Each structure stands twice: as structure tokens, then as C-alpha cells.
Amino acid sequence: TPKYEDLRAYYTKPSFEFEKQFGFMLKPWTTVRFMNVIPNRFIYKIALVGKDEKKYKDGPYDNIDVFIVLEDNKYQLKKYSVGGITKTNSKKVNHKVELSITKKDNQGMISRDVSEYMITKEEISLKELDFKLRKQLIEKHNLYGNMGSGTIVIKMKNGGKYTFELHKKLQEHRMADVIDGTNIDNIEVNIK
Ligand SMILES: CC(=O)N[C@@H]1[C@@H](O[C@@H]2O[C@@H](C)[C@@H](O)[C@@H](O)[C@@H]2O)[C@H](O[C@@H]2O[C@H](CO)[C@H](O)[C@H](O[C@]3(C(=O)O)C[C@H](O)[C@@H](NC(C)=O)[C@H]([C@H](O)[C@H](O)CO)O3)[C@H]2O)[C@@H](CO)O[C@@H]1O
């Protein structure tokens, strides 16, 4: 059967979260543009992919939150990330959503567990949902040990849904997509 070393490695990387930040653009040096953020002793460069290229103009953009995962890249930039830019919270959010997980092991044995997942952002990137949920599946359910396929489905109060396919990384352009965190109703996971 197949291994999933690359996915387990990616989704166990540390993540960084920076809130109420000032995002700024410098003169473009390549086709892809990058928002800069300096929350500490480092300058982080966030690639504007998918919807973000048209979303952000010259800037600056204050009152933003960024979800950062440091990626390997062709420029050997040490602090480079993709997507994950959202509007900062107007107030505190502690929104509970049901998380149901079904897992089928290699012997065909099925398990289930239901828990609560806390949404703490008004506006949340698919990047942050995908990354933190997969890390939790690895840590609590051994995702990418024996099994590495299936889906995470984010189900919305308005009937919308967002699907993350577990057998591959989230498509880069989708890391820029953002959704109303307060409108998430429940999350269904199926591992096989
Ligand atoms: C080359 C490439 O990256 N192409 C992508 C599309 O992805 C490919 O085609 C898909 C059909 C699938 O085969 C995938 O493996 C390929 O990489 C991408 O299409 C989305 O793919 C995902 C799964 O990876 C979902 O199926 C998504 O559908 C939904 C969803 O369930 O997430 C449908 C849903 O109705 C919709 N929700 C709302 C409220 O509109 C969401 C939502 O638009 C997205 O999740 C936002 O990111 O999508 C497929 O649409 C496609 C869109 O990202 O972009 C390239 O074309």
C-alpha cells in the first residue's frame, strides 16, 4: 500500500498566527506579488494567489490577520508563505461547531467520534481550516500513518460547503479563499 510521508511532514509543520497586523506591498519584482508583514524580528512575505491578486491593490492594508506556514520556494526566501490573509475580528468569537469523524482502517474496521471544534475568527481562510484540522487528525487520529485518503467537509449554515481532499495538499489558490467563520455549522471528516 502507499505511504504518505510528504503529507504528514507538511501538515505537522509549525504554523504562525499574527493578528491586527499592517500589511504592505513593495514594488513588484516578479509576476506574483507579495504582501509583507513585520510582527516581530522577521519580515514575512505572503504570496498573493488566487482571489488575492485582484483583491489587494497598492495598500497598505491595516487590521489584517495572517495564518502562516513557511514553505520551500525557488527564491530560497526564509519567511515565505501562501494565502491565509483575512480581516481581523471586530470582537471576540467563540463559535462551537460539531466535528464528526468516521475512519475506516485497512482491515475495514470503522470508528466514529463526535467532538466540538472552536471557531475563533469572524473571517477565516480555507488555509487555516485545512491546516489545523489535518494537524488535529494526525495528532488525534493517526492520519497519514496507515490511511491517507478521504475528505474534510466544512458545512455552512446557508447550505454551502468547502471540501478538502486528504490524499493531496490543498490547492495553492484555495489557500487565499476566505469564508464567514460565524456561518460554519459543522465539519464532517471521512478517512479511508
Ligand atoms: C487544476 C486545479 O487545481 N483545479 C482546481 C479545481 O480542482 C480540481 O478539480 C476538482 C473537480 C477536483 O477534481 C480536484 O481534485 C482538482 O484539483 C478546483 O475545484 C474544487 O476542488 C475541490 C476539491 O479539491 C472541491 O471539489 C470544489 O468544489 C466545492 C467544494 O466542495 O469545495 C463545491 C462547493 O459547492 C463550493 N462552495 C461554494 C460555497 O461555492 C466550493 C468552493 O467554491 C471552493 O471550495 C472554494 O475553494 O467548491 C471544487 O470546485 C477549483 C476551485 O477551487 O479550482 C481549480 O479549477
PDB file of N, CA and C in Angstrom, residues 61-156:
ATOM      1  N   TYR A  61      -2.551  47.715   3.917  1.00  0.00           N
ATOM      2  CA  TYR A  61      -3.745  47.075   4.475  1.00  0.00           C
ATOM      3  C   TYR A  61      -3.572  46.835   5.945  1.00  0.00           C
ATOM      4  N   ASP A  62      -4.149  47.699   6.774  1.00  0.00           N
ATOM      5  CA  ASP A  62      -4.025  47.515   8.216  1.00  0.00           C
ATOM      6  C   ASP A  62      -5.207  46.668   8.734  1.00  0.00           C
ATOM      7  N   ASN A  63      -5.125  46.241   9.995  1.00  0.00           N
ATOM      8  CA  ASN A  63      -6.186  45.436  10.628  1.00  0.00           C
ATOM      9  C   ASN A  63      -6.410  44.087   9.927  1.00  0.00           C
ATOM     10  N   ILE A  64      -5.312  43.470   9.477  1.00  0.00           N
ATOM     11  CA  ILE A  64      -5.386  42.137   8.908  1.00  0.00           C
ATOM     12  C   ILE A  64      -4.796  41.088   9.834  1.00  0.00           C
ATOM     13  N   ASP A  65      -5.258  39.857   9.629  1.00  0.00           N
ATOM     14  CA  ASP A  65      -4.736  38.714  10.334  1.00  0.00           C
ATOM     15  C   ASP A  65      -4.092  37.843   9.252  1.00  0.00           C
ATOM     16  N   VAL A  66      -3.006  37.164   9.614  1.00  0.00           N
ATOM     17  CA  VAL A  66      -2.327  36.261   8.695  1.00  0.00           C
ATOM     18  C   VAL A  66      -2.073  34.908   9.363  1.00  0.00           C
ATOM     19  N   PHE A  67      -2.333  33.828   8.616  1.00  0.00           N
ATOM     20  CA  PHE A  67      -2.061  32.463   9.029  1.00  0.00           C
ATOM     21  C   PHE A  67      -0.893  32.021   8.139  1.00  0.00           C
ATOM     22  N   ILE A  68       0.252  31.775   8.767  1.00  0.00           N
ATOM     23  CA  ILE A  68       1.479  31.491   8.054  1.00  0.00           C
ATOM     24  C   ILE A  68       1.996  30.084   8.262  1.00  0.00           C
ATOM     25  N   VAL A  69       2.401  29.482   7.140  1.00  0.00           N
ATOM     26  CA  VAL A  69       3.041  28.175   7.100  1.00  0.00           C
ATOM     27  C   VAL A  69       4.269  28.410   6.214  1.00  0.00           C
ATOM     28  N   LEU A  70       5.466  28.209   6.754  1.00  0.00           N
ATOM     29  CA  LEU A  70       6.685  28.529   5.985  1.00  0.00           C
ATOM     30  C   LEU A  70       6.971  27.469   4.947  1.00  0.00           C
ATOM     31  N   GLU A  71       7.013  27.875   3.686  1.00  0.00           N
ATOM     32  CA  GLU A  71       7.206  26.958   2.552  1.00  0.00           C
ATOM     33  C   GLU A  71       8.543  27.043   1.905  1.00  0.00           C
ATOM     34  N   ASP A  72       8.908  25.918   1.280  1.00  0.00           N
ATOM     35  CA  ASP A  72      10.090  25.808   0.455  1.00  0.00           C
ATOM     36  C   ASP A  72       9.727  26.597  -0.797  1.00  0.00           C
ATOM     37  N   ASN A  73      10.673  27.303  -1.395  1.00  0.00           N
ATOM     38  CA  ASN A  73      10.374  28.059  -2.594  1.00  0.00           C
ATOM     39  C   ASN A  73      11.616  28.237  -3.444  1.00  0.00           C
ATOM     40  N   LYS A  74      11.417  28.612  -4.701  1.00  0.00           N
ATOM     41  CA  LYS A  74      12.537  28.746  -5.633  1.00  0.00           C
ATOM     42  C   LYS A  74      13.487  29.931  -5.387  1.00  0.00           C
ATOM     43  N   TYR A  75      13.076  30.878  -4.553  1.00  0.00           N
ATOM     44  CA  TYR A  75      13.915  32.020  -4.232  1.00  0.00           C
ATOM     45  C   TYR A  75      14.730  31.788  -2.965  1.00  0.00           C
ATOM     46  N   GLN A  76      14.527  30.642  -2.309  1.00  0.00           N
ATOM     47  CA  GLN A  76      15.185  30.345  -1.030  1.00  0.00           C
ATOM     48  C   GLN A  76      14.889  31.444   0.005  1.00  0.00           C
ATOM     49  N   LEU A  77      13.697  32.024  -0.065  1.00  0.00           N
ATOM     50  CA  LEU A  77      13.276  33.023   0.923  1.00  0.00           C
ATOM     51  C   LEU A  77      12.969  32.229   2.182  1.00  0.00           C
ATOM     52  N   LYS A  78      13.510  32.702   3.296  1.00  0.00           N
ATOM     53  CA  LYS A  78      13.356  32.013   4.566  1.00  0.00           C
ATOM     54  C   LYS A  78      11.994  32.188   5.211  1.00  0.00           C
ATOM     55  N   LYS A  79      11.318  33.312   4.946  1.00  0.00           N
ATOM     56  CA  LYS A  79       9.991  33.559   5.541  1.00  0.00           C
ATOM     57  C   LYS A  79       8.998  33.850   4.434  1.00  0.00           C
ATOM     58  N   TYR A  80       8.536  32.765   3.818  1.00  0.00           N
ATOM     59  CA  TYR A  80       7.656  32.795   2.679  1.00  0.00           C
ATOM     60  C   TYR A  80       6.445  31.920   2.993  1.00  0.00           C
ATOM     61  N   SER A  81       5.259  32.450   2.727  1.00  0.00           N
ATOM     62  CA  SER A  81       4.009  31.705   2.932  1.00  0.00           C
ATOM     63  C   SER A  81       3.016  32.049   1.814  1.00  0.00           C
ATOM     64  N   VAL A  82       1.956  31.262   1.692  1.00  0.00           N
ATOM     65  CA  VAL A  82       0.978  31.432   0.591  1.00  0.00           C
ATOM     66  C   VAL A  82      -0.422  31.549   1.149  1.00  0.00           C
ATOM     67  N   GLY A  83      -1.133  32.612   0.762  1.00  0.00           N
ATOM     68  CA  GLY A  83      -2.517  32.790   1.175  1.00  0.00           C
ATOM     69  C   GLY A  83      -2.715  33.065   2.649  1.00  0.00           C
ATOM     70  N   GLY A  84      -3.904  32.745   3.163  1.00  0.00           N
ATOM     71  CA  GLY A  84      -4.163  32.913   4.594  1.00  0.00           C
ATOM     72  C   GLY A  84      -4.299  34.310   5.166  1.00  0.00           C
ATOM     73  N   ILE A  85      -4.695  35.274   4.327  1.00  0.00           N
ATOM     74  CA  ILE A  85      -4.881  36.658   4.772  1.00  0.00           C
ATOM     75  C   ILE A  85      -6.380  36.936   4.979  1.00  0.00           C
ATOM     76  N   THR A  86      -6.747  37.452   6.156  1.00  0.00           N
ATOM     77  CA  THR A  86      -8.139  37.756   6.452  1.00  0.00           C
ATOM     78  C   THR A  86      -8.314  39.095   7.190  1.00  0.00           C
ATOM     79  N   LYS A  87      -9.562  39.533   7.290  1.00  0.00           N
ATOM     80  CA  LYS A  87      -9.915  40.718   8.069  1.00  0.00           C
ATOM     81  C   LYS A  87      -9.869  40.347   9.548  1.00  0.00           C
ATOM     82  N   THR A  88      -9.294  41.210  10.387  1.00  0.00           N
ATOM     83  CA  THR A  88      -9.210  40.926  11.825  1.00  0.00           C
ATOM     84  C   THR A  88     -10.593  40.964  12.461  1.00  0.00           C
ATOM     85  N   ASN A  89     -10.756  40.274  13.573  1.00  0.00           N
ATOM     86  CA  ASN A  89     -12.030  40.253  14.281  1.00  0.00           C
ATOM     87  C   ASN A  89     -12.465  41.651  14.771  1.00  0.00           C
ATOM     88  N   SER A  90     -13.750  41.968  14.653  1.00  0.00           N
ATOM     89  CA  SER A  90     -14.309  43.216  15.209  1.00  0.00           C
ATOM     90  C   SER A  90     -14.564  43.021  16.717  1.00  0.00           C
ATOM     91  N   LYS A  91     -14.686  41.760  17.124  1.00  0.00           N
ATOM     92  CA  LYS A  91     -14.915  41.392  18.519  1.00  0.00           C
ATOM     93  C   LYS A  91     -14.525  39.932  18.745  1.00  0.00           C
ATOM     94  N   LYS A  92     -14.516  39.508  20.004  1.00  0.00           N
ATOM     95  CA  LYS A  92     -14.176  38.119  20.317  1.00  0.00           C
ATOM     96  C   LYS A  92     -15.234  37.155  19.781  1.00  0.00           C
ATOM     97  N   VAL A  93     -14.774  36.023  19.240  1.00  0.00           N
ATOM     98  CA  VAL A  93     -15.649  34.967  18.700  1.00  0.00           C
ATOM     99  C   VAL A  93     -15.260  33.625  19.316  1.00  0.00           C
ATOM    100  N   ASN A  94     -16.253  32.910  19.826  1.00  0.00           N
ATOM    101  CA  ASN A  94     -16.070  31.564  20.376  1.00  0.00           C
ATOM    102  C   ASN A  94     -17.252  30.763  19.900  1.00  0.00           C
ATOM    103  N   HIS A  95     -17.174  30.344  18.645  1.00  0.00           N
ATOM    104  CA  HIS A  95     -18.252  29.691  17.973  1.00  0.00           C
ATOM    105  C   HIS A  95     -18.020  28.180  17.874  1.00  0.00           C
ATOM    106  N   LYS A  96     -18.840  27.411  18.594  1.00  0.00           N
ATOM    107  CA  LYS A  96     -18.739  25.953  18.637  1.00  0.00           C
ATOM    108  C   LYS A  96     -19.363  25.304  17.406  1.00  0.00           C
ATOM    109  N   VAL A  97     -18.676  24.317  16.821  1.00  0.00           N
ATOM    110  CA  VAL A  97     -19.224  23.572  15.683  1.00  0.00           C
ATOM    111  C   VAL A  97     -18.968  22.069  15.904  1.00  0.00           C
ATOM    112  N   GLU A  98     -19.955  21.240  15.582  1.00  0.00           N
ATOM    113  CA  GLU A  98     -19.804  19.794  15.726  1.00  0.00           C
ATOM    114  C   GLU A  98     -18.784  19.271  14.709  1.00  0.00           C
ATOM    115  N   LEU A  99     -17.841  18.460  15.182  1.00  0.00           N
ATOM    116  CA  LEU A  99     -16.846  17.814  14.372  1.00  0.00           C
ATOM    117  C   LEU A  99     -17.079  16.301  14.441  1.00  0.00           C
ATOM    118  N   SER A 100     -17.465  15.675  13.330  1.00  0.00           N
ATOM    119  CA  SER A 100     -17.728  14.221  13.319  1.00  0.00           C
ATOM    120  C   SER A 100     -16.745  13.576  12.408  1.00  0.00           C
ATOM    121  N   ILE A 101     -16.099  12.529  12.917  1.00  0.00           N
ATOM    122  CA  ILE A 101     -15.058  11.850  12.201  1.00  0.00           C
ATOM    123  C   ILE A 101     -15.408  10.380  12.038  1.00  0.00           C
ATOM    124  N   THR A 102     -15.335   9.889  10.804  1.00  0.00           N
ATOM    125  CA  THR A 102     -15.507   8.475  10.522  1.00  0.00           C
ATOM    126  C   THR A 102     -14.202   8.016   9.934  1.00  0.00           C
ATOM    127  N   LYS A 103     -13.648   6.928  10.458  1.00  0.00           N
ATOM    128  CA  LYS A 103     -12.413   6.421   9.898  1.00  0.00           C
ATOM    129  C   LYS A 103     -12.546   4.926   9.644  1.00  0.00           C
ATOM    130  N   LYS A 104     -12.017   4.503   8.496  1.00  0.00           N
ATOM    131  CA  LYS A 104     -12.051   3.100   8.065  1.00  0.00           C
ATOM    132  C   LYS A 104     -10.625   2.645   7.927  1.00  0.00           C
ATOM    133  N   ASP A 105     -10.219   1.663   8.734  1.00  0.00           N
ATOM    134  CA  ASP A 105      -8.852   1.199   8.694  1.00  0.00           C
ATOM    135  C   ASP A 105      -8.627   0.186   7.559  1.00  0.00           C
ATOM    136  N   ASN A 106      -7.398  -0.304   7.442  1.00  0.00           N
ATOM    137  CA  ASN A 106      -7.046  -1.226   6.351  1.00  0.00           C
ATOM    138  C   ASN A 106      -7.686  -2.620   6.424  1.00  0.00           C
ATOM    139  N   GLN A 107      -8.257  -2.952   7.583  1.00  0.00           N
ATOM    140  CA  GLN A 107      -8.955  -4.221   7.789  1.00  0.00           C
ATOM    141  C   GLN A 107     -10.462  -4.027   7.614  1.00  0.00           C
ATOM    142  N   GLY A 108     -10.859  -2.806   7.238  1.00  0.00           N
ATOM    143  CA  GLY A 108     -12.255  -2.463   7.007  1.00  0.00           C
ATOM    144  C   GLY A 108     -13.038  -2.137   8.263  1.00  0.00           C
ATOM    145  N   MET A 109     -12.336  -1.937   9.380  1.00  0.00           N
ATOM    146  CA  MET A 109     -12.998  -1.638  10.642  1.00  0.00           C
ATOM    147  C   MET A 109     -13.263  -0.143  10.740  1.00  0.00           C
ATOM    148  N   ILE A 110     -14.490   0.171  11.146  1.00  0.00           N
ATOM    149  CA  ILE A 110     -14.973   1.547  11.192  1.00  0.00           C
ATOM    150  C   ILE A 110     -15.042   2.103  12.600  1.00  0.00           C
ATOM    151  N   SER A 111     -14.653   3.360  12.749  1.00  0.00           N
ATOM    152  CA  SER A 111     -14.792   4.044  14.019  1.00  0.00           C
ATOM    153  C   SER A 111     -15.371   5.418  13.745  1.00  0.00           C
ATOM    154  N   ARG A 112     -15.917   5.961  14.829  1.00  0.00           N
ATOM    155  CA  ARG A 112     -16.590   7.224  14.854  1.00  0.00           C
ATOM    156  C   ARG A 112     -16.336   7.988  16.137  1.00  0.00           C
ATOM    157  N   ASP A 113     -16.282   9.303  16.040  1.00  0.00           N
ATOM    158  CA  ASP A 113     -16.241  10.083  17.256  1.00  0.00           C
ATOM    159  C   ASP A 113     -16.743  11.468  16.946  1.00  0.00           C
ATOM    160  N   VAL A 114     -17.454  12.029  17.903  1.00  0.00           N
ATOM    161  CA  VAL A 114     -18.012  13.337  17.730  1.00  0.00           C
ATOM    162  C   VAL A 114     -17.422  14.199  18.812  1.00  0.00           C
ATOM    163  N   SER A 115     -17.051  15.422  18.446  1.00  0.00           N
ATOM    164  CA  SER A 115     -16.469  16.392  19.380  1.00  0.00           C
ATOM    165  C   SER A 115     -16.864  17.800  18.915  1.00  0.00           C
ATOM    166  N   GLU A 116     -16.380  18.816  19.625  1.00  0.00           N
ATOM    167  CA  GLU A 116     -16.644  20.202  19.269  1.00  0.00           C
ATOM    168  C   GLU A 116     -15.338  20.855  18.835  1.00  0.00           C
ATOM    169  N   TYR A 117     -15.412  21.614  17.755  1.00  0.00           N
ATOM    170  CA  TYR A 117     -14.273  22.362  17.243  1.00  0.00           C
ATOM    171  C   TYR A 117     -14.602  23.829  17.416  1.00  0.00           C
ATOM    172  N   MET A 118     -13.680  24.591  17.971  1.00  0.00           N
ATOM    173  CA  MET A 118     -13.913  26.002  18.228  1.00  0.00           C
ATOM    174  C   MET A 118     -13.417  26.910  17.096  1.00  0.00           C
ATOM    175  N   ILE A 119     -14.321  27.749  16.598  1.00  0.00           N
ATOM    176  CA  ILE A 119     -14.001  28.741  15.556  1.00  0.00           C
ATOM    177  C   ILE A 119     -13.853  30.052  16.322  1.00  0.00           C
ATOM    178  N   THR A 120     -12.691  30.698  16.212  1.00  0.00           N
ATOM    179  CA  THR A 120     -12.453  31.928  16.956  1.00  0.00           C
ATOM    180  C   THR A 120     -12.261  33.154  16.051  1.00  0.00           C
ATOM    181  N   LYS A 121     -12.479  32.991  14.745  1.00  0.00           N
ATOM    182  CA  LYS A 121     -12.337  34.093  13.801  1.00  0.00           C
ATOM    183  C   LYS A 121     -13.612  34.373  13.022  1.00  0.00           C
ATOM    184  N   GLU A 122     -13.927  35.655  12.875  1.00  0.00           N
ATOM    185  CA  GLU A 122     -15.077  36.074  12.103  1.00  0.00           C
ATOM    186  C   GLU A 122     -14.882  35.693  10.644  1.00  0.00           C
ATOM    187  N   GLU A 123     -13.696  35.985  10.111  1.00  0.00           N
ATOM    188  CA  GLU A 123     -13.342  35.677   8.721  1.00  0.00           C
ATOM    189  C   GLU A 123     -12.164  34.713   8.815  1.00  0.00           C
ATOM    190  N   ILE A 124     -12.261  33.550   8.172  1.00  0.00           N
ATOM    191  CA  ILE A 124     -11.209  32.529   8.287  1.00  0.00           C
ATOM    192  C   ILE A 124     -10.869  31.958   6.934  1.00  0.00           C
ATOM    193  N   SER A 125      -9.566  31.810   6.683  1.00  0.00           N
ATOM    194  CA  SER A 125      -9.112  31.244   5.414  1.00  0.00           C
ATOM    195  C   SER A 125      -9.301  29.744   5.344  1.00  0.00           C
ATOM    196  N   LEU A 126      -9.505  29.222   4.131  1.00  0.00           N
ATOM    197  CA  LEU A 126      -9.525  27.785   3.944  1.00  0.00           C
ATOM    198  C   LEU A 126      -8.157  27.224   4.314  1.00  0.00           C
ATOM    199  N   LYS A 127      -7.103  28.022   4.153  1.00  0.00           N
ATOM    200  CA  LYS A 127      -5.751  27.598   4.542  1.00  0.00           C
ATOM    201  C   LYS A 127      -5.683  27.171   6.010  1.00  0.00           C
ATOM    202  N   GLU A 128      -6.211  28.013   6.871  1.00  0.00           N
ATOM    203  CA  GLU A 128      -6.181  27.799   8.321  1.00  0.00           C
ATOM    204  C   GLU A 128      -7.048  26.619   8.739  1.00  0.00           C
ATOM    205  N   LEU A 129      -8.220  26.488   8.135  1.00  0.00           N
ATOM    206  CA  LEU A 129      -9.120  25.350   8.429  1.00  0.00           C
ATOM    207  C   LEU A 129      -8.481  24.053   8.012  1.00  0.00           C
ATOM    208  N   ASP A 130      -8.021  24.008   6.771  1.00  0.00           N
ATOM    209  CA  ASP A 130      -7.375  22.821   6.217  1.00  0.00           C
ATOM    210  C   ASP A 130      -6.157  22.425   7.042  1.00  0.00           C
ATOM    211  N   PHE A 131      -5.314  23.398   7.366  1.00  0.00           N
ATOM    212  CA  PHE A 131      -4.055  23.060   8.029  1.00  0.00           C
ATOM    213  C   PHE A 131      -4.279  22.568   9.461  1.00  0.00           C
ATOM    214  N   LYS A 132      -5.032  23.333  10.235  1.00  0.00           N
ATOM    215  CA  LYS A 132      -5.235  22.977  11.649  1.00  0.00           C
ATOM    216  C   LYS A 132      -6.063  21.689  11.799  1.00  0.00           C
ATOM    217  N   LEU A 133      -7.044  21.485  10.923  1.00  0.00           N
ATOM    218  CA  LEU A 133      -7.866  20.261  11.006  1.00  0.00           C
ATOM    219  C   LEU A 133      -7.014  19.033  10.644  1.00  0.00           C
ATOM    220  N   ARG A 134      -6.186  19.124   9.614  1.00  0.00           N
ATOM    221  CA  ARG A 134      -5.368  17.974   9.272  1.00  0.00           C
ATOM    222  C   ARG A 134      -4.347  17.687  10.378  1.00  0.00           C
ATOM    223  N   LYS A 135      -3.768  18.727  10.971  1.00  0.00           N
ATOM    224  CA  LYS A 135      -2.825  18.500  12.058  1.00  0.00           C
ATOM    225  C   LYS A 135      -3.530  17.787  13.215  1.00  0.00           C
ATOM    226  N   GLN A 136      -4.758  18.201  13.508  1.00  0.00           N
ATOM    227  CA  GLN A 136      -5.506  17.546  14.567  1.00  0.00           C
ATOM    228  C   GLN A 136      -5.819  16.093  14.213  1.00  0.00           C
ATOM    229  N   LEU A 137      -6.109  15.816  12.941  1.00  0.00           N
ATOM    230  CA  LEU A 137      -6.373  14.433  12.506  1.00  0.00           C
ATOM    231  C   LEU A 137      -5.123  13.562  12.628  1.00  0.00           C
ATOM    232  N   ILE A 138      -3.960  14.145  12.326  1.00  0.00           N
ATOM    233  CA  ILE A 138      -2.697  13.446  12.505  1.00  0.00           C
ATOM    234  C   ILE A 138      -2.497  13.161  14.002  1.00  0.00           C
ATOM    235  N   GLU A 139      -2.578  14.202  14.824  1.00  0.00           N
ATOM    236  CA  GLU A 139      -2.280  14.057  16.242  1.00  0.00           C
ATOM    237  C   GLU A 139      -3.235  13.152  17.019  1.00  0.00           C
ATOM    238  N   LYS A 140      -4.513  13.265  16.730  1.00  0.00           N
ATOM    239  CA  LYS A 140      -5.531  12.540  17.480  1.00  0.00           C
ATOM    240  C   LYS A 140      -5.997  11.264  16.793  1.00  0.00           C
ATOM    241  N   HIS A 141      -5.832  11.174  15.470  1.00  0.00           N
ATOM    242  CA  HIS A 141      -6.358  10.011  14.735  1.00  0.00           C
ATOM    243  C   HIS A 141      -5.406   9.293  13.826  1.00  0.00           C
ATOM    244  N   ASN A 142      -4.131   9.633  13.899  1.00  0.00           N
ATOM    245  CA  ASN A 142      -3.090   8.978  13.100  1.00  0.00           C
ATOM    246  C   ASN A 142      -3.251   9.105  11.586  1.00  0.00           C
ATOM    247  N   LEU A 143      -3.874  10.189  11.126  1.00  0.00           N
ATOM    248  CA  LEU A 143      -3.970  10.468   9.682  1.00  0.00           C
ATOM    249  C   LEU A 143      -2.555  10.442   9.115  1.00  0.00           C
ATOM    250  N   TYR A 144      -2.404   9.770   7.972  1.00  0.00           N
ATOM    251  CA  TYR A 144      -1.123   9.622   7.273  1.00  0.00           C
ATOM    252  C   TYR A 144      -0.162   8.610   7.898  1.00  0.00           C
ATOM    253  N   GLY A 145      -0.651   7.827   8.855  1.00  0.00           N
ATOM    254  CA  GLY A 145       0.097   6.682   9.389  1.00  0.00           C
ATOM    255  C   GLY A 145      -0.238   5.529   8.429  1.00  0.00           C
ATOM    256  N   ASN A 146      -1.397   4.925   8.614  1.00  0.00           N
ATOM    257  CA  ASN A 146      -1.893   3.812   7.777  1.00  0.00           C
ATOM    258  C   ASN A 146      -2.818   4.254   6.646  1.00  0.00           C
ATOM    259  N   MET A 147      -3.648   5.264   6.924  1.00  0.00           N
ATOM    260  CA  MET A 147      -4.640   5.766   5.959  1.00  0.00           C
ATOM    261  C   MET A 147      -4.339   7.215   5.610  1.00  0.00           C
ATOM    262  N   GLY A 148      -4.610   7.580   4.372  1.00  0.00           N
ATOM    263  CA  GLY A 148      -4.318   8.940   3.921  1.00  0.00           C
ATOM    264  C   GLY A 148      -5.241   9.498   2.876  1.00  0.00           C
ATOM    265  N   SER A 149      -6.431   8.920   2.739  1.00  0.00           N
ATOM    266  CA  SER A 149      -7.392   9.415   1.768  1.00  0.00           C
ATOM    267  C   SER A 149      -8.719   9.709   2.451  1.00  0.00           C
ATOM    268  N   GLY A 150      -9.603  10.384   1.721  1.00  0.00           N
ATOM    269  CA  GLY A 150     -10.897  10.816   2.233  1.00  0.00           C
ATOM    270  C   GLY A 150     -11.044  12.313   2.123  1.00  0.00           C
ATOM    271  N   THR A 151     -11.939  12.871   2.927  1.00  0.00           N
ATOM    272  CA  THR A 151     -12.224  14.303   2.894  1.00  0.00           C
ATOM    273  C   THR A 151     -12.536  14.930   4.268  1.00  0.00           C
ATOM    274  N   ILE A 152     -12.335  16.239   4.314  1.00  0.00           N
ATOM    275  CA  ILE A 152     -12.855  17.118   5.340  1.00  0.00           C
ATOM    276  C   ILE A 152     -13.891  17.976   4.594  1.00  0.00           C
ATOM    277  N   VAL A 153     -15.105  18.044   5.121  1.00  0.00           N
ATOM    278  CA  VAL A 153     -16.117  18.909   4.520  1.00  0.00           C
ATOM    279  C   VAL A 153     -16.573  19.940   5.551  1.00  0.00           C
ATOM    280  N   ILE A 154     -16.427  21.217   5.230  1.00  0.00           N
ATOM    281  CA  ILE A 154     -16.911  22.312   6.075  1.00  0.00           C
ATOM    282  C   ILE A 154     -18.333  22.633   5.586  1.00  0.00           C
ATOM    283  N   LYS A 155     -19.338  22.404   6.422  1.00  0.00           N
ATOM    284  CA  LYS A 155     -20.734  22.633   6.055  1.00  0.00           C
ATOM    285  C   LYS A 155     -21.237  23.939   6.679  1.00  0.00           C
ATOM    286  N   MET A 156     -21.806  24.786   5.831  1.00  0.00           N
ATOM    287  CA  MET A 156     -22.250  26.108   6.233  1.00  0.00           C
ATOM    288  C   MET A 156     -23.748  26.203   6.550  1.00  0.00           C
TER     289      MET A 156
END
